[PDB]
Design a protein around this ligand. Structure first.
Ligand SMILES: Cc1ccc(-c2c(C)c3c(c(C)c2[C@H](OC(C)(C)C)C(=O)O)N(S(C)(=O)=O)Cc2cccc(F)c2-3)c(O)c1
Length: 138
């Protein structure tokens, strides 16, 4: 519920890897299809994420995701810490719904992220995250 908390996991589809980041308090989502489930990709993703949102802490359902020196170096540089304390199903649901409209899985993934973030439920996840962060600054 704290505005700086994110959750990061990889899920699989069509023999590819989808990295999914969830802003816990809002439900807001960012995702990329990555070539390999490696620390290098995770580190690079964290750097991008941190330059865009105020990322303070990151949770995951697989702690071994964060063991690589590349990941530790990214968290160090960006000032992130990890912690031990379903979007994957919902995302895969939406992906299946728009899948036939794109050739590439990565395209379908971004269409799914779009739909999820804008969907009204009375505000959208996209609206919630900006309100939460903005309120937290002032
Ligand atoms: C902020 C920051 C800077 C560099 C690295 C790093 C880092 C830290 C490394 C790296 C690279 C290439 C980077 C960084 O690339 C990414 C994709 C991992 C981010 C780079 O372009 O220099 N490479 S490695 C292991 O071959 O991938 C060389 C290295 C060797 C041993 C440990 C290690 F963490 C690194 C890092 O993980 C985080």
């Amino acid at each position: 519920c704290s505005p700086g908390i994110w959750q990061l996991d990889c899920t699989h589809l069509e023999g590819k890897v989808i990295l999914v980041a969830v802003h816990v308090a809002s439900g807001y989502i960012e995702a990329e299809v990555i070539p390999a489930e490696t620390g290098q990709e995770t580190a690079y993703f964290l750097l991008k994420l941190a330059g865009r949102w105020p990322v303070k802490t990151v949770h995951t359902d697989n702690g071994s995701n964060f063991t690589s020196t590349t990941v530790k170096a990214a968290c160090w540089w960006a000032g992130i810490k990890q912690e031990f304390g379903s979007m994957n199903k919902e995302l895969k649901k939406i992906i299946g719904q728009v899948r036939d409209q794109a050739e590439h899985l990565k395209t379908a993934v971004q269409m799914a992220v779009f739909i999820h973030n804008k969907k009204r439920k009375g505000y959208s996840a996209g609206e919630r995250i900006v309100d939460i962060i903005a309120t937290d600054i002032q």
